[PDB]
Design a binder for this molecule. Structure first.
Ligand code: NI
Ligand code: NI
Lengths: 186, 186
Protein backbone atom coordinates (compact mmCIF):
# COMPACT_ATOMS: atom_id res chain seq x y z
CA UNK A 1 0.00 0.00 0.00
CA UNK A 2 1.04 3.59 -0.95
CA UNK A 3 -1.64 6.30 -0.35
CA UNK A 4 -1.85 9.99 -1.40
CA UNK A 5 -4.35 12.70 -0.45
CA UNK A 6 -5.27 15.28 -3.12
CA UNK A 7 -6.55 18.50 -1.48
CA UNK A 8 -8.33 21.64 -2.87
CA UNK A 9 -8.31 24.97 -0.93
CA UNK A 10 -10.43 28.15 -1.27
CA UNK A 11 -13.72 26.76 -2.69
CA UNK A 12 -16.43 26.11 -3.49
CA UNK A 13 -16.53 28.14 -6.82
CA UNK A 14 -19.47 28.13 -9.34
CA UNK A 15 -18.54 26.10 -12.55
CA UNK A 16 -15.05 24.84 -11.27
CA UNK A 17 -16.24 22.90 -8.14
CA UNK A 18 -18.56 20.82 -10.40
CA UNK A 19 -15.72 20.43 -12.96
CA UNK A 20 -13.12 19.21 -10.34
CA UNK A 21 -15.69 16.76 -8.83
CA UNK A 22 -16.83 15.24 -12.22
CA UNK A 23 -13.14 14.47 -13.05
CA UNK A 24 -12.54 12.80 -9.64
CA UNK A 25 -15.83 10.75 -9.83
CA UNK A 26 -15.07 9.67 -13.45
CA UNK A 27 -11.57 8.35 -12.48
CA UNK A 28 -12.86 6.49 -9.29
CA UNK A 29 -10.72 8.87 -7.08
CA UNK A 30 -11.61 10.94 -3.94
CA UNK A 31 -10.17 14.20 -2.52
CA UNK A 32 -10.47 16.66 0.36
CA UNK A 33 -11.92 20.14 -0.19
CA UNK A 34 -10.86 22.79 2.38
CA UNK A 35 -13.70 25.25 1.89
CA UNK A 36 -13.86 29.03 2.79
CA UNK A 37 -17.04 29.73 4.88
CA UNK A 38 -18.10 32.87 2.92
CA UNK A 39 -17.91 30.83 -0.31
CA UNK A 40 -19.66 27.80 1.24
CA UNK A 41 -22.69 29.73 2.54
CA UNK A 42 -23.27 31.31 -0.94
CA UNK A 43 -23.12 27.81 -2.61
CA UNK A 44 -24.54 25.14 -0.26
CA UNK A 45 -25.60 22.86 -3.23
CA UNK A 46 -21.87 22.74 -4.33
CA UNK A 47 -20.93 21.32 -0.82
CA UNK A 48 -23.74 18.68 -1.23
CA UNK A 49 -22.11 17.97 -4.64
CA UNK A 50 -18.56 17.49 -3.13
CA UNK A 51 -19.88 15.02 -0.51
CA UNK A 52 -22.50 12.97 -2.51
CA UNK A 53 -19.51 12.10 -4.78
CA UNK A 54 -17.61 10.58 -1.73
CA UNK A 55 -15.17 13.53 -1.11
CA UNK A 56 -14.25 14.94 2.37
CA UNK A 57 -14.92 18.57 3.30
CA UNK A 58 -12.57 20.42 5.70
CA UNK A 59 -12.65 24.01 7.00
CA UNK A 60 -10.39 26.78 5.56
CA UNK A 61 -11.92 29.42 7.95
CA UNK A 62 -14.93 31.72 7.38
CA UNK A 63 -13.12 34.92 6.15
CA UNK A 64 -9.78 33.44 4.85
CA UNK A 65 -7.66 35.94 6.88
CA UNK A 66 -4.35 35.07 8.58
CA UNK A 67 -5.50 33.64 11.97
CA UNK A 68 -2.05 33.82 13.67
CA UNK A 69 -2.93 36.98 15.67
CA UNK A 70 -6.72 36.53 16.29
CA UNK A 71 -8.10 36.60 19.86
CA UNK A 72 -9.39 33.10 20.89
CA UNK A 73 -13.14 34.08 20.62
CA UNK A 74 -12.46 35.30 17.05
CA UNK A 75 -10.80 31.89 16.25
CA UNK A 76 -13.98 30.25 17.67
CA UNK A 77 -16.25 32.46 15.47
CA UNK A 78 -14.28 31.76 12.27
CA UNK A 79 -14.26 27.95 12.90
CA UNK A 80 -17.73 27.45 14.43
CA UNK A 81 -19.57 29.49 11.71
CA UNK A 82 -17.84 27.41 8.96
CA UNK A 83 -18.61 24.08 10.76
CA UNK A 84 -22.29 25.14 10.99
CA UNK A 85 -22.51 26.24 7.32
CA UNK A 86 -21.03 22.86 6.28
CA UNK A 87 -23.21 20.60 8.53
CA UNK A 88 -26.44 22.55 7.56
CA UNK A 89 -25.57 22.08 3.83
CA UNK A 90 -24.44 18.34 3.88
CA UNK A 91 -25.45 16.73 7.23
CA UNK A 92 -21.71 15.60 7.56
CA UNK A 93 -19.63 17.27 10.34
CA UNK A 94 -16.09 18.07 9.18
CA UNK A 95 -13.11 16.92 11.32
CA UNK A 96 -10.20 18.83 9.61
CA UNK A 97 -9.11 22.46 9.38
CA UNK A 98 -6.34 23.96 7.20
CA UNK A 99 -5.50 27.49 8.39
CA UNK A 100 -5.15 30.24 5.78
CA UNK A 101 -1.46 30.43 4.66
CA UNK A 102 -0.86 27.47 7.05
CA UNK A 103 -0.28 30.10 9.79
CA UNK A 104 -1.11 28.75 13.30
CA UNK A 105 -0.08 28.86 16.91
CA UNK A 106 -0.64 26.62 19.99
CA UNK A 107 -3.78 28.61 20.84
CA UNK A 108 -5.28 27.86 17.40
CA UNK A 109 -4.43 24.11 17.87
CA UNK A 110 -6.14 24.13 21.34
CA UNK A 111 -9.28 25.97 20.02
CA UNK A 112 -9.47 23.72 16.89
CA UNK A 113 -9.24 20.51 19.05
CA UNK A 114 -11.96 21.78 21.41
CA UNK A 115 -14.28 22.09 18.36
CA UNK A 116 -13.43 18.45 17.34
CA UNK A 117 -11.05 19.66 14.52
CA UNK A 118 -7.49 18.49 13.62
CA UNK A 119 -5.27 21.09 11.95
CA UNK A 120 -3.62 19.96 8.75
CA UNK A 121 -1.11 21.64 6.50
CA UNK A 122 0.35 19.79 3.45
CA UNK A 123 3.78 18.39 2.42
CA UNK A 124 3.63 18.73 -1.45
CA UNK A 125 3.21 22.31 -2.87
CA UNK A 126 3.20 22.50 -6.71
CA UNK A 127 2.70 26.35 -6.32
CA UNK A 128 -0.58 26.09 -8.39
CA UNK A 129 -1.99 29.41 -6.88
CA UNK A 130 0.39 31.55 -9.05
CA UNK A 131 -1.05 29.93 -12.29
CA UNK A 132 1.84 27.94 -13.90
CA UNK A 133 2.22 25.66 -17.00
CA UNK A 134 -0.11 22.62 -16.70
CA UNK A 135 3.00 20.44 -17.50
CA UNK A 136 4.99 22.21 -14.67
CA UNK A 137 2.24 21.47 -12.03
CA UNK A 138 2.29 17.75 -13.05
CA UNK A 139 6.16 17.52 -12.76
CA UNK A 140 6.33 19.07 -9.23
CA UNK A 141 3.47 16.78 -8.04
CA UNK A 142 5.02 13.62 -9.60
CA UNK A 143 8.65 14.36 -8.56
CA UNK A 144 7.66 15.21 -4.90
CA UNK A 145 4.84 12.69 -4.13
CA UNK A 146 5.81 9.86 -1.65
CA UNK A 147 3.62 7.53 0.49
CA UNK A 148 1.63 9.80 2.87
CA UNK A 149 1.79 12.92 0.63
CA UNK A 150 -0.89 15.61 1.19
CA UNK A 151 -0.87 17.68 -2.03
CA UNK A 152 -1.90 21.36 -1.70
CA UNK A 153 -3.91 22.52 -4.74
CA UNK A 154 -6.54 25.26 -5.17
CA UNK A 155 -10.16 25.19 -6.43
CA UNK A 156 -11.18 27.70 -9.20
CA UNK A 157 -7.95 27.27 -11.30
CA UNK A 158 -8.26 26.12 -14.99
CA UNK A 159 -4.47 25.25 -15.07
CA UNK A 160 -5.28 22.92 -12.07
CA UNK A 161 -8.45 21.46 -13.76
CA UNK A 162 -6.08 20.69 -16.71
CA UNK A 163 -3.35 18.95 -14.59
CA UNK A 164 -5.75 16.66 -12.67
CA UNK A 165 -6.12 13.70 -15.12
CA UNK A 166 -2.35 13.38 -15.90
CA UNK A 167 -1.51 13.58 -12.09
CA UNK A 168 -4.17 10.94 -11.27
CA UNK A 169 -3.12 8.71 -14.20
CA UNK A 170 0.68 8.71 -13.49
CA UNK A 171 0.19 8.20 -9.69
CA UNK A 172 -2.25 5.32 -10.36
CA UNK A 173 0.53 3.87 -12.64
CA UNK A 174 3.16 4.37 -9.85
CA UNK A 175 0.86 2.24 -7.53
CA UNK A 176 -0.76 5.01 -5.36
CA UNK A 177 -4.32 4.68 -3.94
CA UNK A 178 -6.20 8.04 -3.58
CA UNK A 179 -7.59 8.66 -0.05
CA UNK A 180 -9.29 11.48 1.91
CA UNK A 181 -7.03 13.26 4.43
CA UNK A 182 -8.93 11.57 7.28
CA UNK A 183 -8.45 8.09 5.83
CA UNK A 184 -4.69 8.90 5.18
CA UNK A 185 -4.12 9.90 8.90
CA UNK A 186 -6.74 7.41 10.45
CA UNK B 1 4.66 42.35 15.27
CA UNK B 2 5.22 40.02 12.25
CA UNK B 3 7.37 36.90 12.96
CA UNK B 4 8.94 34.28 10.63
CA UNK B 5 10.74 31.01 11.43
CA UNK B 6 13.65 29.99 9.17
CA UNK B 7 14.20 26.20 9.33
CA UNK B 8 17.04 23.89 8.08
CA UNK B 9 16.46 20.12 7.54
CA UNK B 10 18.90 17.19 7.10
CA UNK B 11 21.97 18.41 9.07
CA UNK B 12 24.36 18.80 10.65
CA UNK B 13 26.97 18.75 7.76
CA UNK B 14 30.76 19.42 8.17
CA UNK B 15 31.71 22.92 6.72
CA UNK B 16 28.04 24.05 5.87
CA UNK B 17 26.54 23.88 9.43
CA UNK B 18 29.28 26.29 10.63
CA UNK B 19 28.73 28.47 7.51
CA UNK B 20 24.89 28.71 7.99
CA UNK B 21 25.33 29.50 11.75
CA UNK B 22 28.04 32.25 11.26
CA UNK B 23 25.67 34.06 8.80
CA UNK B 24 22.71 33.88 11.24
CA UNK B 25 24.86 35.03 14.26
CA UNK B 26 26.39 37.91 12.21
CA UNK B 27 22.91 39.24 11.20
CA UNK B 28 21.45 38.95 14.81
CA UNK B 29 18.94 36.27 13.54
CA UNK B 30 18.00 32.77 14.91
CA UNK B 31 16.69 29.61 13.19
CA UNK B 32 15.56 26.04 13.83
CA UNK B 33 17.69 23.08 12.69
CA UNK B 34 15.80 19.79 12.19
CA UNK B 35 18.72 17.39 12.48
CA UNK B 36 19.03 13.72 11.22
CA UNK B 37 20.19 11.45 14.12
CA UNK B 38 22.86 9.57 12.08
CA UNK B 39 24.38 12.95 11.09
CA UNK B 40 24.07 14.37 14.63
CA UNK B 41 25.88 11.47 16.37
CA UNK B 42 28.85 11.77 13.91
CA UNK B 43 29.10 15.58 14.60
CA UNK B 44 28.12 16.37 18.21
CA UNK B 45 30.34 19.55 18.29
CA UNK B 46 28.25 20.96 15.33
CA UNK B 47 25.02 20.59 17.49
CA UNK B 48 26.83 22.45 20.37
CA UNK B 49 27.67 25.08 17.69
CA UNK B 50 23.96 25.45 16.54
CA UNK B 51 22.78 25.95 20.16
CA UNK B 52 25.58 28.15 21.69
CA UNK B 53 24.64 30.62 18.89
CA UNK B 54 20.97 30.76 20.22
CA UNK B 55 19.36 28.46 17.54
CA UNK B 56 16.73 25.71 18.28
CA UNK B 57 17.37 22.06 17.44
CA UNK B 58 14.47 19.78 16.41
CA UNK B 59 14.42 16.08 15.42
CA UNK B 60 14.23 14.93 11.75
CA UNK B 61 14.37 11.20 12.80
CA UNK B 62 17.43 8.94 13.24
CA UNK B 63 17.52 7.24 9.76
CA UNK B 64 15.57 9.80 7.61
CA UNK B 65 13.21 7.11 6.18
CA UNK B 66 9.49 7.66 5.50
CA UNK B 67 7.88 6.93 8.93
CA UNK B 68 4.28 6.63 7.63
CA UNK B 69 4.29 2.79 7.77
CA UNK B 70 6.62 2.09 10.78
CA UNK B 71 5.37 -0.04 13.71
CA UNK B 72 4.97 2.14 16.89
CA UNK B 73 8.11 0.69 18.64
CA UNK B 74 10.14 1.59 15.52
CA UNK B 75 8.73 5.19 15.69
CA UNK B 76 9.85 5.22 19.37
CA UNK B 77 13.39 4.00 18.44
CA UNK B 78 13.84 6.59 15.65
CA UNK B 79 12.64 9.49 17.92
CA UNK B 80 14.14 8.44 21.28
CA UNK B 81 17.66 7.71 19.85
CA UNK B 82 17.71 11.20 18.18
CA UNK B 83 16.46 12.94 21.38
CA UNK B 84 19.25 11.19 23.34
CA UNK B 85 21.98 12.05 20.79
CA UNK B 86 20.87 15.72 20.93
CA UNK B 87 20.59 16.05 24.76
CA UNK B 88 24.01 14.25 25.29
CA UNK B 89 25.65 16.69 22.79
CA UNK B 90 24.02 20.03 23.97
CA UNK B 91 22.30 19.51 27.38
CA UNK B 92 19.09 21.06 25.74
CA UNK B 93 16.11 18.67 25.20
CA UNK B 94 14.38 19.30 21.86
CA UNK B 95 10.57 19.79 21.78
CA UNK B 96 9.89 19.63 17.97
CA UNK B 97 9.96 16.91 15.32
CA UNK B 98 9.60 17.30 11.53
CA UNK B 99 8.93 13.90 9.92
CA UNK B 100 10.90 12.97 6.79
CA UNK B 101 8.91 14.11 3.69
CA UNK B 102 6.34 15.53 6.18
CA UNK B 103 4.69 12.06 6.09
CA UNK B 104 2.79 11.28 9.35
CA UNK B 105 -0.26 9.58 10.74
CA UNK B 106 -2.26 9.81 14.02
CA UNK B 107 -0.07 7.08 15.53
CA UNK B 108 3.09 9.13 14.85
CA UNK B 109 1.40 12.22 16.47
CA UNK B 110 0.45 10.12 19.57
CA UNK B 111 4.00 8.59 19.89
CA UNK B 112 5.68 12.02 19.30
CA UNK B 113 3.48 13.69 22.03
CA UNK B 114 4.25 10.88 24.51
CA UNK B 115 7.98 11.69 24.06
CA UNK B 116 7.27 15.43 24.73
CA UNK B 117 7.55 16.31 20.96
CA UNK B 118 5.25 18.45 18.75
CA UNK B 119 5.19 17.55 15.06
CA UNK B 120 5.78 20.44 12.69
CA UNK B 121 5.70 20.66 8.94
CA UNK B 122 6.19 24.04 7.15
CA UNK B 123 4.02 26.42 5.06
CA UNK B 124 6.67 28.05 2.73
CA UNK B 125 8.61 25.66 0.38
CA UNK B 126 11.12 27.43 -1.96
CA UNK B 127 12.01 23.89 -3.35
CA UNK B 128 15.72 24.48 -2.32
CA UNK B 129 16.48 20.64 -2.20
CA UNK B 130 16.53 20.41 -6.06
CA UNK B 131 19.34 23.11 -6.23
CA UNK B 132 17.82 26.18 -8.01
CA UNK B 133 19.05 29.72 -8.93
CA UNK B 134 19.98 31.66 -5.74
CA UNK B 135 17.74 34.52 -7.10
CA UNK B 136 14.82 32.02 -7.60
CA UNK B 137 15.02 30.76 -3.94
CA UNK B 138 14.88 34.41 -2.70
CA UNK B 139 11.78 35.24 -4.89
CA UNK B 140 9.71 32.20 -3.72
CA UNK B 141 10.61 32.95 -0.04
CA UNK B 142 9.82 36.72 -0.36
CA UNK B 143 6.61 36.30 -2.45
CA UNK B 144 5.17 33.56 -0.10
CA UNK B 145 6.26 34.72 3.41
CA UNK B 146 3.39 36.06 5.66
CA UNK B 147 3.18 36.50 9.47
CA UNK B 148 3.60 33.00 10.99
CA UNK B 149 5.54 31.53 8.02
CA UNK B 150 7.71 28.44 8.71
CA UNK B 151 10.18 28.31 5.78
CA UNK B 152 11.47 24.84 4.79
CA UNK B 153 15.14 24.99 3.72
CA UNK B 154 17.92 22.36 3.78
CA UNK B 155 21.39 22.32 5.39
CA UNK B 156 24.43 21.39 3.17
CA UNK B 157 23.29 23.45 0.09
CA UNK B 158 25.65 26.20 -1.28
CA UNK B 159 22.71 27.74 -3.32
CA UNK B 160 20.92 28.04 0.12
CA UNK B 161 24.06 29.48 1.89
CA UNK B 162 24.02 32.07 -0.96
CA UNK B 163 20.30 33.03 -0.60
CA UNK B 164 20.39 33.52 3.20
CA UNK B 165 21.63 37.16 3.49
CA UNK B 166 19.26 38.58 0.79
CA UNK B 167 16.25 36.68 2.38
CA UNK B 168 17.17 37.95 5.88
CA UNK B 169 17.81 41.51 4.61
CA UNK B 170 14.54 41.91 2.60
CA UNK B 171 12.36 40.34 5.39
CA UNK B 172 14.02 42.61 7.99
CA UNK B 173 13.12 45.53 5.61
CA UNK B 174 9.49 44.25 5.31
CA UNK B 175 9.29 44.42 9.20
CA UNK B 176 9.66 40.66 10.12
CA UNK B 177 11.32 39.52 13.38
CA UNK B 178 13.17 36.13 13.11
CA UNK B 179 12.07 33.55 15.75
CA UNK B 180 12.65 29.86 16.58
CA UNK B 181 9.72 27.56 15.71
CA UNK B 182 8.97 27.17 19.43
CA UNK B 183 8.84 30.92 20.02
CA UNK B 184 6.63 31.33 16.83
CA UNK B 185 4.02 28.73 18.15
CA UNK B 186 4.48 29.53 21.97
NI1 NI C 1 -6.43 29.53 0.98
NI1 NI D 1 14.77 15.71 5.17
Amino acid sequence: GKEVALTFDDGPFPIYTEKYVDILKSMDVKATFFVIGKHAEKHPELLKYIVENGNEIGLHSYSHFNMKKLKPEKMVEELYKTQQIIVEATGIKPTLFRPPFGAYNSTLIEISNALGLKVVLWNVDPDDWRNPSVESVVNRVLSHTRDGSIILMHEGKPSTLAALPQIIKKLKEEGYKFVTVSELLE
